[PDB]
């Protein structure tokens, strides 16, 4: 039941984002959408992404949007009588069990390392573009 109420509140916040009356409240609900989304990811079992969503989305992107706004103004049926006791747990593999961070870093920088450098180039493009356009310096 924790998933249902959280998803519903996220949906309501997302709906109110697009039909907001002023940009400030739009950004405020935009933050709550990511808060609920991070909570949902936390329920999913991915703690790392659930907190990157705070660090990036409502840590830097939301702050950026708020700064700009300030100025310039087949399913399985719910019957579960004989399924909560049919869980087979393979104990092998629980010993030396990695987290969501070690597993990701194992293959992000070593096997699929070209895409990582492509993302670096994307970041450099953003950094250069934000400067060429907006340097008045008068």
């Amino acid at each position: 039941m924790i998933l249902s109420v959280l998803s519903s509140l996220a949906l309501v916040s997302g709906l109110m984002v697009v039909r907001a009356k002023n940009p400030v409240h739009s950004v405020l609900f935009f933050i709550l959408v990511f808060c609920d989304t991070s909570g949902l990811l936390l329920l999913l079992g991915l703690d790392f992404f659930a907190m990157i969503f705070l660090v990036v989305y409502i840590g830097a992107i939301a702050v950026l949007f708020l700064f700009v706004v300030m100025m310039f103004h087949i399913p399985l049926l719910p019957t579960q009588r004989n399924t909560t006791s049919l869980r087979y747990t393979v104990y092998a593999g629980k010993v030396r069990s990695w987290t969501n961070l070690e597993t990701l870093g194992n293959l992000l920088y070593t096997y699929y390392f070209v895409w990582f450098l492509v993302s670096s180039l994307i970041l450099l493009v953003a950094m250069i573009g934000a400067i060429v356009l907006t340097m008045h310096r008068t």
Binding site: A92, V95, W98, N106
Partner: protein, 85 residues
């Protein structure tokens, strides 16, 4: 001599061998029709060849994974347990 006795054989030299022309015509027809049949056959090839995935360049993973199934993050849980002895 006089004009016509020279213009005659001049024109005769100017004209070509008809036997060569007929031989070249029948030849050109023969190889042109053979090449036409060849191109007709070539246009019948489907875009996707019958083998496709069977080709060695289109697998790229049956000979890459076996040398990777030993690295950490890809091992069957029952590999590190009995590898000690």
């Amino acid at each position: 001599g006089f004009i016509m006795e020279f213009a005659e054989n001049l024109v005769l030299r100017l004209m070509e061998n008809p036997e060569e022309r007929d031989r070249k015509a029948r030849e050109h027809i023969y190889e042109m029709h053979e090449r036409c049949k060849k191109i007709k056959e070539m246009w019948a090839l489907p875009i996707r060849p019958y083998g496709f995935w069977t080709f060695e360049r289109h697998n790229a993973q049956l000979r890459w994974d076996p040398q990777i199934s030993q690295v950490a993050g890809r091992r069957d849980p029952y590999d590190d347990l009995l590898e000690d002895n």
